[PDB]
């Protein structure tokens, strides 16, 4: 009895309403433990009207709910239990944007593995993750959930995430089904405003935005979630071209199912697509399989079928897909597969898990500036820790951490005191609130992620910090955003550090003491003034439940920072969108020659971002020899070997991310000045040299041309290697086809 | 006839002579007195020059044309072109400013006068109008266009072509127009000039193309390509664009295509290949004339010998250039536009300046007028303060290459004239343009300098404050310099320069009522100014008559009647923000900012500061309820929509009544509203008039997902008011007629 036979047999037993019921993923409402079977959701499950549920927590609650299905519904079809497990379950790793800066695919996969272990131990068998939306717009709150602006890096991370979640077998009780989102183009919302209109050409979609989604699918992701945005004037959720012709294009078949985003079907009414029945039929016809919360499928599909607006086959295909996911997950052989109390008791938020998170977090930090050897700090003397983010636990996990043990996180103050012990004195001061305008603080600290609010006049509180700082040999400024300043529906028209904090920072600098800016953020910020005036800048994103410890490992040099930016840091928001893989234009500005009239440039700011893609410093220094190519004249399907000597020429052991970029000089369409095509993170002891090697083939040269044909064209290419997208060793080559 | 004449001419022509017609080189300096031995002379004699541009003075142009007529083998005369953008010697407001008149008659007149002056000076071809839609205030070239709306843009494009070209090309008072820049130029990424452009086909057709199309339908003689790529192919080499779109219908276009300045050569930089390759690409795409770069002149013959182009491609391009010259009357009289007497009497005349002054005053947009600050009483004392208070050469704005910049009327000048003996005007610099001198320098190129005060800003501010304290009202002339906009004048910051904001603050702090007369070439972020300044008059850049026109507004000689053609954002973080937007699936209900999980920001409302079509008056206008002839229509019927407008204020005035239509449901998402009509009407104080609009299914059509141009049966909302924001509305139902389905 293989899957297809079993599933066909089952569906032959089902009524029309039961098939439709499988397509329903409703909101659950409150469920009183001890009386699940008589709760609001119970009746629906009993009537076969529920295919799955989500964001229900605890194996105890889940088992009982699952028992209603197994024992009290006619066919005893078990439910899927999903959740947003985004960057950890109870143990929280850094936010995804932070994790992507590790450029370490092993660590990425590992964090996903541990998340799956924890979530599955607590009854969850399906996560709405990874989010792989490409974005070039820092205003958008959701950049925190993604992996930056690059399709290659993004695609690599997609594979790592899906593999971590899903393992080699869906039926394993430590593996959960992943869900790539949000298909598609969500990250191009106009003016960085969440949910706003998206528009772009087909050729831009294929080269610049689609690749990460495709990587997830090729990796075997089990499901796909639709996006809130329209494309070509049709909401993704109702977009047949996208959901059928692209997603399920013959060769490269996606086998899983498509679930809508939260009431995305109903929102098509607001989009302007028609009434609930109309937009529901549109969604099903497009290839949508499961309806999240809005119940458009449940309440309208029969009427449409009776009216011949949809077919039985359409309903059947969607039903079968849901049932197949359940079968693959092991639910028809054991509906309680993911419900073991002892696993939940022993495998969640363990000391070992927290240790791994701590180690992973330290490798996500990006050191953006370190003048005059300020870092690492000596573990002696006195250290002043100042800022609205110095001593707060609940913000450390950042946004999208619904299952995290927020109140058990390690504050920076806590982590610092511990690491220092009796070797160094740690002094503390609030310094300032998150921002002037209390109402902004409030909407930025939703979901219980509150900060201590100081009712005293800002000058009073600053004077307090300055006077404390004057007693220290070095100041550590913990500034930046709060957790919920990014995330969903957290768009900012201003991407600077809040004025109040900058005013505070100014006061700290004026003490004359060395200041280290420890920066908390869920997005790229505009930091020109900070870069000019602060000796050392460490971007720690949001590091998770172990933030305080991981950050202290960095500060004292237990761990040498090795992160690299996966997204461009602009000089101001007026530069947006600014990104490394751009076209040359017909009037490029020669490097270093800002400003030039009649070139492509601004009157009031240079063209360069502040920090480019791939940027990141170390406590040590890395020296690149000259790029060596095995050939500069290639023919057909040959392999080019590119190699380079890398030397740790600094004072500390450390790792660096070696990056490979390729520029296609001439094409039938304009080609980007460069695109990432490989990378390698390597650790080097002080004074050690290693040969780093990349192997290139024509596959690395391919792109989607004007007719959307994926292929490469003969001609000249530039091969580049270095420690960021700007500082590169390069060499030109000629690559020819052959008859 | 023309066809027989040109065919015969072309039969006499050598390959090189045909190629030469396609050349539009830079001229280099031509010493008046020895044009026939100048640098450009030899090339003309050899038949290598199809035309020239930016040569000025009928005297010079006459002697250059003589070279072609008397000293070339076939005597084929030249076109003479120029950027006549908003007036020749008499400067009208910058285009964006002109757009705010919402007066198509006035607009056509300004073009008419501009053609009269240019043609009188030997010019027979203008690189105008630029009709690029833009939703990005950062782009300095918004100043050259007409805002963010396709319908208003299309109406203006039509009015401009009509004004220039008149009834017949061969009139010595008509010149050939050139709609630019085809296409999509105004969507350059991050508002940085020349930067990458990218969008969907369906957005192109509904949102960006219409103005270009109206130019063509109005009979524009030529089209200029743009610098941006499209779908990864530079416009100048984009065959789909230049041939499939531009020349889709039978005899739709029929004119010729010229490249932008070295746009072919720049395709090399784009990454499309070498000069020959990109030249051949351009010719195949449908480009006919090569501006400055000489890629056509130097490479076409080789490409032809190599089979990369065809003879017929060269012949077709050459043919179009000759037809242009034929239509313009050049083969009948190569000197037609070369009359010394016309040039002496018909240019920068008192009459022309008067008209410019009239038009300018109609282009101003009154953004705020609290507590009846405006209009000013012509009595007591008035303090004029700001870096734009007393400067002539900036008044004409950018793209005013033929303007009499130095003869422009400064604001101090106009005000003192108007005040006469009735009020005393007091002046003070207040501050420089910006705290950054190198920014000032680069923002005041092309000779448009501002006098620089080397004293400490605080000393100068105090100087102005002490003057202000002597006045009963203060007039602050602040904003941009002329060349802070225009080409390659992109700004990442769209506020009034910080130094000036600081000055402004010190003025308000005097307790005196302050009027902000704002000089700008772009929308600016003005939330703070709107919050603190009693009155705000946006004067754009009004031309050579700026001071007189502005003074007309200030004292109430002319009741301001302009309305924004582009949205004013609260900050650059909202960009792009525009009125004709999609609803999204999570729209923020009106008045409800902030709402979590709706489409909105944490730190700023969704609303711009001032919406499309916004404009105040010295008086007030009351709208009655919207009357519709029917709520249930079928097939090709006419809906009549009427409304009572009443002047309920204290002054005579005009207001622009705007018609918007919303298509509620569609096979694709439809914008929450679209401008579909307008009428500007003058009303005596207390007068009431019935404004009427005729609506048909044509007004309902759009380009669907498959790019089919059609309307769909269903509900629509008809809206009327003096704002894209404040409207009377009514829903209707419109069905197809089964009988007439074809
Ligand atoms: O001046 C208008 C016209 O100038 C064009 O050429 C520039 C050129 O780019 C620059 O190198 C030189 O120093 O100045 C000349 C003339 O100003 C420019 O390329 C055009 O876009 C511009 O419209
Ligand atoms: O909670 C996450 C989820 O909430 C969704 O519904 C919101 C709803 O918009 C709001 O009115 C209510 O107060 O909170 C609920 C749920 O907390 C929201 O629409 C989703 O996008 C969001 O992911
Ligand atoms: O929680 C389920 C879904 O809720 C939606 O509102 C979010 O946009 C998704 O990212 C999330 O997976
Ligand atoms: O001078 C002719 C052309 O020069 C170009 O550089 C400008 O961008 C065009 O708008 C202008 O018409
Ligand atoms: Ca190539």
XYZ file of C-alpha atoms in Angstrom, chain A residues 234-647:
414
model
C -3.136 40.563 -9.931
C -2.718 39.626 -6.261
C -0.261 36.724 -5.975
C -2.956 34.646 -4.247
C -5.123 34.821 -7.361
C -2.299 34.859 -9.908
C -2.483 31.758 -12.096
C 0.664 32.563 -14.073
C 2.617 32.731 -10.835
C 1.037 29.829 -8.919
C 0.672 27.423 -11.821
C 2.799 28.371 -14.848
C 5.843 29.533 -12.872
C 5.568 27.497 -9.654
C 4.471 24.236 -11.251
C 6.189 24.639 -14.635
C 6.456 21.142 -16.166
C 10.190 20.428 -15.712
C 11.316 21.225 -12.172
C 7.984 20.165 -10.705
C 6.967 21.473 -7.303
C 5.070 18.568 -5.736
C 3.864 20.167 -2.502
C 0.880 22.379 -1.765
C 0.241 26.109 -1.689
C -1.207 27.776 1.411
C -2.421 31.376 1.337
C -1.051 34.053 3.596
C -3.269 35.240 6.477
C -6.708 35.974 4.908
C -4.933 36.732 1.606
C -7.970 35.442 -0.301
C -10.369 37.778 1.498
C -7.954 40.672 1.018
C -8.320 40.256 -2.730
C -11.715 41.873 -2.163
C -9.913 44.963 -0.869
C -7.405 44.654 -3.735
C -10.429 45.220 -5.993
C -10.808 41.735 -7.490
C -14.468 41.095 -6.607
C -16.475 39.415 -3.848
C -15.504 36.489 -1.625
C -16.881 33.768 -3.879
C -15.245 35.285 -6.944
C -11.810 35.714 -5.382
C -11.971 32.273 -3.748
C -12.617 30.624 -7.100
C -9.791 32.695 -8.546
C -7.453 31.398 -5.842
C -8.371 27.739 -6.388
C -8.095 28.030 -10.172
C -4.691 29.692 -9.739
C -3.324 26.672 -7.869
C -4.005 27.598 -4.241
C -4.550 24.545 -2.033
C -5.118 25.684 1.557
C -7.039 28.702 2.825
C -5.574 30.405 5.894
C -8.170 31.850 8.326
C -10.505 33.645 5.899
C -12.678 30.583 5.202
C -13.447 31.634 1.627
C -12.872 28.057 0.446
C -15.004 26.483 3.173
C -17.951 28.803 2.640
C -18.026 29.344 -1.135
C -16.414 26.497 -3.094
C -19.551 24.345 -3.241
C -21.629 27.186 -4.661
C -18.967 27.809 -7.321
C -18.832 24.123 -8.187
C -22.626 23.958 -8.483
C -22.397 26.953 -10.821
C -19.612 25.433 -12.927
C -17.197 28.230 -12.031
C -14.679 25.650 -10.779
C -14.384 21.914 -11.353
C -14.383 18.768 -9.231
C -10.876 18.020 -10.492
C -9.675 21.336 -9.103
C -11.099 20.536 -5.683
C -9.732 16.985 -5.877
C -6.188 18.017 -6.807
C -5.969 20.470 -3.906
C -7.388 17.927 -1.468
C -4.973 15.225 -2.579
C -2.027 17.592 -2.077
C -2.980 18.284 1.536
C -3.467 14.574 2.227
C -0.069 13.810 0.702
C 1.666 16.266 3.016
C -0.022 14.554 5.974
C 0.943 11.137 4.642
C 4.579 12.169 4.141
C 4.752 13.606 7.641
C 3.772 10.202 9.047
C 0.353 11.263 10.295
C -1.682 8.389 8.834
C 0.516 5.804 10.534
C 0.676 7.813 13.760
C -1.456 10.959 14.228
C 0.352 11.576 17.538
C 3.824 11.215 15.978
C 4.843 14.710 17.132
C 3.151 14.448 20.548
C 5.536 13.067 23.154
C 5.582 14.761 26.549
C 9.026 13.453 27.462
C 10.557 14.907 24.288
C 8.895 18.210 25.093
C 10.294 17.947 28.623
C 13.835 16.974 27.658
C 14.525 18.432 24.206
C 13.447 22.065 24.410
C 15.490 25.086 25.522
C 18.197 22.760 26.857
C 21.555 24.100 28.098
C 23.169 22.502 25.041
C 20.735 24.237 22.693
C 21.376 27.571 24.369
C 25.125 27.005 24.061
C 24.868 26.445 20.303
C 22.711 29.548 19.906
C 25.334 31.545 21.793
C 28.111 30.338 19.490
C 26.080 30.889 16.342
C 25.023 34.401 17.397
C 28.630 35.562 17.855
C 29.323 34.613 14.259
C 26.461 36.752 12.924
C 27.802 40.099 14.147
C 29.184 42.524 11.576
C 32.038 44.756 12.704
C 31.489 47.967 10.710
C 34.320 50.063 12.134
C 37.205 49.611 14.543
C 39.672 52.494 14.640
C 42.760 52.499 16.853
C 42.401 48.955 18.233
C 39.503 49.887 20.517
C 38.153 46.360 20.116
C 38.593 43.910 21.557
C 38.241 45.494 24.994
C 40.701 44.662 27.734
C 39.033 42.727 30.538
C 40.334 45.189 33.116
C 39.622 48.671 34.450
C 36.118 50.111 34.310
C 33.534 49.870 31.541
C 30.437 52.035 31.184
C 27.395 50.479 29.517
C 24.796 53.006 28.389
C 21.627 53.073 26.286
C 17.934 52.091 26.103
C 19.124 48.646 24.995
C 21.781 47.963 27.644
C 19.587 46.112 30.133
C 16.491 44.606 28.534
C 15.764 40.909 28.078
C 12.547 40.740 26.077
C 13.897 42.669 23.078
C 16.992 40.482 22.594
C 15.246 37.814 20.479
C 14.010 40.479 18.046
C 10.790 40.184 16.053
C 9.110 37.017 14.791
C 10.061 35.047 17.908
C 6.601 34.019 19.095
C 7.716 30.883 20.959
C 10.929 32.359 22.365
C 11.509 32.451 26.128
C 11.815 36.248 25.966
C 12.009 36.857 29.739
C 14.834 34.338 30.050
C 17.095 36.103 27.549
C 20.466 37.441 28.665
C 20.593 41.231 28.703
C 23.787 42.944 27.570
C 24.325 44.261 31.080
C 23.872 40.742 32.458
C 26.158 39.126 29.908
C 28.803 41.790 30.417
C 28.847 41.569 34.219
C 29.203 37.785 34.030
C 32.066 37.839 31.517
C 33.884 40.572 33.444
C 33.621 38.929 36.862
C 36.142 40.478 39.253
C 38.569 41.435 36.474
C 36.601 44.516 35.414
C 34.018 46.907 36.838
C 30.861 47.338 34.752
C 28.933 50.569 35.323
C 25.423 51.163 33.980
C 23.193 54.077 32.995
C 19.900 54.327 31.106
C 21.200 57.252 29.048
C 17.910 57.807 27.251
C 14.613 56.270 26.220
C 14.199 54.624 22.816
C 12.882 57.865 21.335
C 11.195 61.154 22.053
C 7.496 60.766 21.233
C 6.243 58.135 23.671
C 3.477 57.092 21.274
C 6.120 55.950 18.764
C 7.885 53.948 21.476
C 4.573 52.257 22.262
C 3.715 51.143 18.730
C 7.357 50.039 18.399
C 7.186 47.878 21.534
C 4.047 45.892 20.818
C 3.546 42.235 21.665
C 4.911 42.600 25.205
C 8.386 43.642 24.033
C 8.423 46.619 26.378
C 11.320 48.891 27.336
C 11.800 50.700 30.645
C 10.520 54.241 30.169
C 12.231 57.126 31.986
C 9.842 60.031 32.733
C 12.725 62.384 33.588
C 13.810 65.242 31.263
C 16.233 63.938 28.618
C 18.998 66.347 29.701
C 18.735 65.003 33.266
C 19.077 61.395 32.095
C 21.932 62.223 29.758
C 23.812 64.065 32.504
C 23.397 60.930 34.587
C 25.042 58.783 31.921
C 27.820 61.271 31.127
C 28.740 61.456 34.810
C 28.834 57.666 35.057
C 30.809 57.395 31.827
C 33.374 59.862 33.167
C 34.262 57.220 35.750
C 35.010 54.569 33.128
C 38.001 53.963 30.849
C 35.701 53.088 27.960
C 32.036 53.540 27.043
C 29.831 50.934 25.403
C 26.756 52.455 23.802
C 23.886 50.001 23.353
C 21.710 51.877 20.870
C 19.472 51.215 17.905
C 15.996 49.837 17.297
C 13.579 47.904 19.455
C 12.585 44.397 18.361
C 9.190 45.305 16.923
C 10.521 48.316 15.044
C 11.059 45.739 12.323
C 8.985 42.685 11.443
C 5.621 42.608 9.685
C 3.819 45.940 9.277
C 6.825 47.695 10.773
C 7.847 50.075 7.952
C 9.970 53.139 8.732
C 10.142 56.197 6.485
C 13.275 57.099 8.458
C 16.160 54.611 8.716
C 18.447 56.420 11.142
C 19.079 55.720 14.801
C 16.306 57.579 16.696
C 17.269 61.218 17.220
C 17.144 60.998 21.026
C 19.749 58.229 20.989
C 22.004 60.103 18.590
C 21.798 63.097 20.910
C 22.815 60.766 23.729
C 25.655 59.287 21.679
C 26.861 62.798 20.908
C 27.010 63.436 24.659
C 29.037 60.276 25.273
C 31.548 61.108 22.538
C 32.039 64.590 23.977
C 33.306 63.081 27.237
C 36.502 62.398 25.320
C 36.395 58.720 26.272
C 36.529 55.969 23.625
C 33.029 54.878 22.621
C 32.023 51.524 21.188
C 28.663 51.571 19.455
C 26.884 48.250 19.905
C 24.073 48.518 17.374
C 20.739 46.698 17.651
C 18.625 46.756 14.496
C 16.411 44.644 12.263
C 17.351 46.611 9.139
C 20.175 48.486 7.414
C 20.409 51.978 8.909
C 21.890 55.248 7.620
C 24.988 55.711 9.763
C 27.221 58.329 8.121
C 27.474 60.545 11.186
C 28.127 57.582 13.466
C 30.808 56.193 11.158
C 32.549 59.574 11.166
C 32.505 60.086 14.936
C 32.518 56.686 16.665
C 35.792 54.742 17.045
C 34.215 51.266 16.850
C 30.871 50.095 15.507
C 29.556 46.582 16.082
C 26.294 45.613 14.403
C 24.706 42.869 16.512
C 21.285 42.848 14.821
C 19.018 40.972 17.217
C 21.018 38.051 18.513
C 18.371 35.906 20.267
C 17.919 34.515 23.793
C 21.699 34.439 24.357
C 22.377 37.966 23.034
C 24.109 39.219 26.177
C 26.626 36.369 26.320
C 27.318 36.229 22.580
C 27.852 39.987 22.449
C 30.257 39.832 25.383
C 32.252 37.090 23.658
C 32.725 39.554 20.809
C 33.471 42.571 22.979
C 36.286 40.837 24.877
C 37.508 38.943 21.839
C 36.546 35.456 22.967
C 35.104 35.341 19.443
C 36.609 37.350 16.573
C 33.780 38.990 14.555
C 33.497 37.477 11.069
C 30.100 38.550 9.753
C 29.610 40.272 6.391
C 26.654 42.405 5.300
C 24.097 40.642 3.117
C 22.373 43.964 2.445
C 23.634 47.421 1.462
C 23.818 50.183 4.096
C 22.851 53.482 2.394
C 24.066 56.963 3.385
C 20.500 58.191 3.577
C 17.034 56.960 2.664
C 17.058 59.166 -0.423
C 19.595 56.744 -1.929
C 17.070 53.916 -1.804
C 16.974 51.644 -3.624
C 20.740 51.184 -3.666
C 22.293 47.757 -4.222
C 25.540 46.152 -5.326
C 24.303 44.180 -8.352
C 23.207 47.197 -10.427
C 23.482 48.027 -14.147
C 26.199 50.453 -15.305
C 23.888 53.041 -16.945
C 24.976 54.978 -20.030
C 26.532 57.695 -17.868
C 28.393 55.940 -15.026
C 30.319 58.079 -12.557
C 34.040 57.233 -12.655
C 35.205 55.823 -9.346
C 36.193 58.571 -6.915
C 35.063 61.491 -9.070
C 31.866 62.595 -7.334
C 30.624 65.082 -8.210
C 30.402 65.344 -12.028
C 27.648 67.185 -13.901
C 25.897 65.070 -16.563
C 26.954 61.835 -14.919
C 24.561 59.553 -13.038
C 24.890 61.064 -9.569
C 23.280 63.311 -6.922
C 23.996 66.959 -6.132
C 23.987 66.303 -2.410
C 25.340 62.818 -1.663
C 27.946 60.491 -3.195
C 26.817 57.451 -5.206
C 28.537 54.985 -2.881
C 26.570 53.461 -0.024
C 28.228 53.781 3.392
C 28.866 50.034 3.619
C 28.604 47.866 0.487
C 27.321 44.302 0.105
C 29.730 41.764 1.613
C 31.338 44.313 3.941
C 32.688 43.263 7.329
C 35.839 43.801 9.356
C 37.826 41.651 11.785
C 39.939 42.144 14.899
C 42.700 40.891 12.611
C 43.582 41.792 9.013
C 43.389 39.742 5.832
C 45.710 40.141 2.865
C 44.928 38.857 -0.618
C 47.619 37.850 -3.079
C 47.007 38.249 -6.799
C 44.153 36.381 -8.460
C 45.425 33.381 -10.417
C 43.370 31.899 -13.253
C 44.045 28.526 -14.883
C 43.091 30.069 -18.225
C 41.916 33.410 -19.629
C 40.707 31.871 -22.879
C 38.077 29.215 -22.418
C 36.089 27.206 -24.936
C 32.786 25.421 -24.313
C 32.058 23.423 -21.142
C 35.470 23.768 -19.523
C 36.246 24.369 -15.875
C 38.047 27.556 -14.878
C 40.049 27.309 -11.683
C 40.354 30.643 -9.864
C 42.748 30.654 -6.903
C 44.108 33.218 -4.465
C 46.463 33.353 -1.483
C 44.877 34.637 1.711
C 46.993 35.691 4.668
